[model samples]
Structures are given as C-alpha cells and as structure tokens.
Target: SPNPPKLTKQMNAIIDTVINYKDSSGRQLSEVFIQLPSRKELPEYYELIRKPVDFKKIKERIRNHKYRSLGDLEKDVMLLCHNAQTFNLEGSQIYEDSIVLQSVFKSARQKIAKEE
Candidate 1:
C-alpha cells in the first residue's frame, strides 16, 4: 500500500477554519461544507468520483415531463449539470478551479436562501 497525497496546506487551513466556526445552534459551519478530493486524488478513494452520472437519463426524464412541478424538474436538472461540469473542469490550475467551485457554491447558496 502507498501513502495518499494529502490536501495542500491552504486547503487544510481552510478546512480547519471552517470546522472551528460554530453557528447559533452550536453546529460547526463545516457541516455545510462537503469535502471532496482534488481530481488527481479521486481515483484512489471514493466510488462517487469513479462513476459517471447518467445525464442522458436525466435529459430523457426532463423531456418526458415526469416531474410534477417546475421546481422539482429544475432541481434535478441543476444536479445533473453540476455533476457533468465537475469533471469538465478537471486539469484547470488551482485558482481557476477554485473560482469555478466558488461560483457554483454561491449559486447553490443563493438558490436555497431564495426559498427561505
């Protein structure tokens, strides 16, 4: 067995800071963050990064109008787009990759907040 390539110091610092920040309910702010591996390290670990999401199936479902409401359909489509785009962003340098991830995170946050 080989030792895994660990997260960069900056990444680790960010994670630690997030983990330390508590909310009004005393829940760690880190609870809201999903820790994912860099694309390079993905293959050695989770099955999730290994499998491709079936966007064709999602498209078919969307086209068939299977969802009862527009909100439901939009949610499914957005998730499908997110999964497909994740791999598409591979090979980008760290700053470029982080910006893309931050944009998606911001969009999701705003979407959720809008419903509140």
Candidate 2:
C-alpha cells in the first residue's frame, strides 16, 4: 500500500470548519474553544452529543484512492464530509452523491485541471 498524500492548506481549512462545529443537537464534538449551543442556552444542557469526524483518517483514505482529476478527488471527499455532517444532523446515515459531484464541479471549474 502507498502512503497517503498530505493535505493542502485549503483542505485543512475545510477540515477545521467541520471539526469546529457541533451536531444539530447542540453538543461540543471537536477539541476547540467554545462550548455547545450558545450564551442564551443553559450550561446544564451542554452534553456529549457525538464525536467529530476523524478527518485525518478520511484524508488518508482519499489520498490513497486514485482519482483522475481534482474534481473527482474532491467529489469523493465531499461525499464523505457531507455524510459525516448528515449523520451529525439527523442521527441517521445517508449517502448523497449528487451534492458531492456538484460541489466538486463548482470547485474544479475555477481551477486549472491537474496535470496527469
């Protein structure tokens, strides 16, 4: 097996965004500043909702998967990200491929095609 590629700066930011936020149920998941919910909410309500995604692991898996273009690459990862978010929001698992493709295509449209 090949080693995983390192994450780009932009990729890291996206991962950070995911890690910083909580699930829809208002619970702290990531290891960062701020608690669950907001100042208006009672501190007692703050509770263990769920764990943040292991994006590092997901990143490795994505890097190992040989995608033909950046579009394909991002498409694959965005699906994983969206799925993670969905699970956090609904407490149910869902796979939405169309949204992933749309995101990838939009991103890739603004960048030069990666050289093979």
Candidate 3:
C-alpha cells in the first residue's frame, strides 16, 4: 500500500489556525491540533487534524470513501478553505484565499499529485 502524504508547512499553518480558532465571543471553537507523531501514529494524527470542517459535507463525503487518494482529500481541503474564506470573516470585503489556506491548497495538491 502507498504511504500517506506528508503535510507541508502551509498545511501545518492551516492546522494551527484551526487549533487556535476563536469564535465571536473570543472563545475557542475548534479542537483540532497538529502533532509530530511517530510513524506508527501518523494515520490517526492525520484524521484528527482533518476533522475541523464540514462545509458542503466534505467530511462526510470524504469519510464515505468518495475520495480515495490524498489528491482527492487535498481538493476537499481546498474547497473547505474556500468556504472558510468565503463566510468566516464578517464585515470584511476581502474574498481572497488567505496565505495559510492557499499555501495548504498548493502544497497538498502538489504533494498528493506527485504521489499519484
């Protein structure tokens, strides 16, 4: 079986954003966090960090094996980031992808594509 994809710096940053995420009351709303796990623990760790969002039912879809490869998972993450960038910020006119999100999208796509 092929090994899972490695997380890039951008992906790490995205995870950090979610782990440190705060809501309107400035209270933390996310429980996801990144960790440097042993090779034996990587799969569980990946699933942990990937559980933060559900826009468009991305998590459910991915969980159903709709995405069979890391590349497919990367696409879902990009869409989730796009959705986050779309509606997460209130009263802001900025509709562009943030550096952290964009970096994760780019790096994950590249690495996952290479694996395929």
Candidate 4:
C-alpha cells in the first residue's frame, strides 16, 4: 500500500538512504518514525507539535516529486527532529532516533549534492 514509484532516480536515492536508516538494535528509524504519533494515546502531542513529519509522508513527497530540490527535502527531514524534540522526552528512544537520523539525512544530502 505504501512505497515509491521510482519516478525521479536521483532524488529517489536520497529518500532511500534516509528511510533505510538503522540504529544499534538493527531496527529502522524509518519504521519507528514511520508515522505520526497516536492522537488517542496522547492528545497533547497534536497541540504541541505544529509541524508533524514522518518518513511515510516524506516518502510521499519524494514519490510525487514534491521534493523539487534538496532544500525542500532538508526542511522535511529536519522537521522530523523538530517534532520529536517537542513531543517526546529528551532521553527517549524516539527522540534519540531523530538525532541520529538527522545526521544520516544530512550526510546523505551532502554526498549527493556535492557529487553533482
């Protein structure tokens, strides 16, 4: 039901790097931060985080070619961390995932951008 269509080959590769990111446990950060938090479980989350982001939505943007440039992709990628820091506690796994993935995304961006 959810996946990429390979429309833009180069941009799609960047999406691939971020979504396939993993951590110490072999669990993908993309999976953990795949979607928004459950509103039923924590209603306050919706109130606090204005710009909610996740890998699922990011992929959707890339798939549709809405991520027209690396700038658009960068903003959405950092939004992942922005939302995480606001909604989750400082030391939580979810919060931690945001930091590492931020690094992963940035590095991938630099690699791709410079090579062109």
Candidate 5:
C-alpha cells in the first residue's frame, strides 16, 4: 500500500514547491505546465513525446495513492520535463521553461535530501 504518511507528506511538499515556482518574469510555470497539451489543438505532441506527464498528474497521483515510491515520483517529473525538452525547440519558451523548472525541482529535491 502506498499509504505512508511521512513519505507522502514530503513528496507533496516537493510538488507544491515545483508547482508554485515562478521565474524572473513573475509568472508561475505550473499554470502553463499543469495540463497536458491539448490533444486536438496540439496533436503532434504525442508524436514527438511518446509519454507525456505533467505536474497536475504527478500531484494527483500522489494524493490518489498511485505512487509507490519516491523514485517513481521523481521519474514522473523527470519524464514530464524530458517530454517538453524533446518536443519543443531548444530556445523556445516552452523548452526554456522546462529546463528552468527542472532545476527548481532538483534544488528542492536535493535540499530535502541533505537534511535527511
């Protein structure tokens, strides 16, 4: 069962931090990355990024008890970031944001690990 309160709590915090992260422009990246690119509007997304993941899905899975291990949670976020970098041009807005947000996630993830 993925019902460990202690573990889930930390994972939840990490999600919150990543979801709330903003750039120097003062815009929250989560607002853009929370949902998957629309299937009809952006049909090519699936073609470019075989597996898509997003912050909303990751957080939702955590609450739904669908995540069994921290590694699984970590991998999902990594995949989410990787998808963006794969599908978008390197200098494009979406691509840049993914990399920036990924570093934020890493910072948070590593910070928590240091104290533990």
Candidate 6:
C-alpha cells in the first residue's frame, strides 16, 4: 500500500488526540476519521481552495451545531477545510495550514484542555 502523505507535527497531534478522544461523559468516540485528499481529489480540492474562508461564519456554524464527541468536531473541521479557502502561500501549501484548519485545532485544544 502507498504510504500516507507526510503530515506536520501539529497535524499528527490533532489526529492522535481525535483517535483517542472521549466525551465529557467518558464515552469513547467512534466514527472519527480523516481522509487526506489524493491526486484524484485535486479537482475538488481546487474548487474548495477557490472559495474564501470566513472565520466568523465557521464559528457561527460551530455554535449552532451539537457534536456527539471530539471526533464529530474533528469531522466538522475536515468538512470546513474542504469548504474554506486559504489566502497565504503557506496556507496553500498544506491542508494543515488552512485558516479553518488552525481554527479547528485551537477549538479542539480548548475542548481537550477542559476534558483533561
């Protein structure tokens, strides 16, 4: 099998946390997974890259939704990345650097901090 694309340290940490995640009620998380895009998904990725990322909009959406666990939140962030656009060259270089991705990471950190 092809080795997975290399991810940044922060990206790896986020995945590790999500995979081991448990809810406030101490329930283990399930159905949480990340699927990095391949060359085949380039067209769709580019389409997503063309749009503008709205942090306020994302936060508002986060506020409105109820996630079952950190895993669900992680999935929401992945979906946001697929929809949100990055502006900087660095942001464009990797999925981990996207504004939405960073924002979600921060959100996850906060949640994890409170839980742990």
TM-score pick, better of 5 and 6? 5
lDDT: the better of candidates 3 and 5: 5
The TM-score values for the models, in the order shown, are: 0.29, 0.31, 0.35, 0.80, 0.86, 0.31
What value does the lDDT take at residue 38 in candidate 3?
A: 47
lDDT of 6 by residue, 56-111 (tens): 43344344444444455455566555553342235453333344344546665665
lDDT of each: 0.41, 0.41, 0.45, 0.78, 0.83, 0.44
Against the correct fold, how does model 1 do in TM-score? Answer: 0.29
Evaluate residue 80 in candidate 5 and report its C-alpha lDDT on the 0 to 100 scale: 91
The sequence of per-residue lDDT tens digits that candidate 5 reaches over residues 11-86 is 8888888898888888998777899867888988877777878887898899988878777888888899898889
Poorest lDDT segment (10 consecutive residues) of candidate 3? 28-37
- In candidate 5, clashing pairs total 0
In model 2, how large is the Cα lDDT of residue 116? 17
Candidate 1, residues 1-116, lDDT tens digits: the string is 32122312222233233335454666543331234454576664334534433334434444454544434534543453355446445554422433343344344434443543
Clashes of each: 0, 0, 0, 0, 0, 0
Candidate 4: give the clashing pairs: none
Give per-residue CA lDDT, model 2, range 22-64, as digits (tens).
4465543443222234425633322432332234554554445
Best by TM-score: 5
- Candidate 4 residue-wise lDDT, 1-116, digit = tens: 33245325556677688888777777888776787768897789888888777778887888777876778788988888888877789999888888988898888887876775
Q: With candidate 1 superimposed using the best TM-score fit, by how many Å does residue 21's alpha carbon deviate from the native?
A: 41
Candidate 2: residue 110 Cα off by (Å):
11
The C-alpha local distance difference test score for the whole of candidate 4 amounts to: 0.78
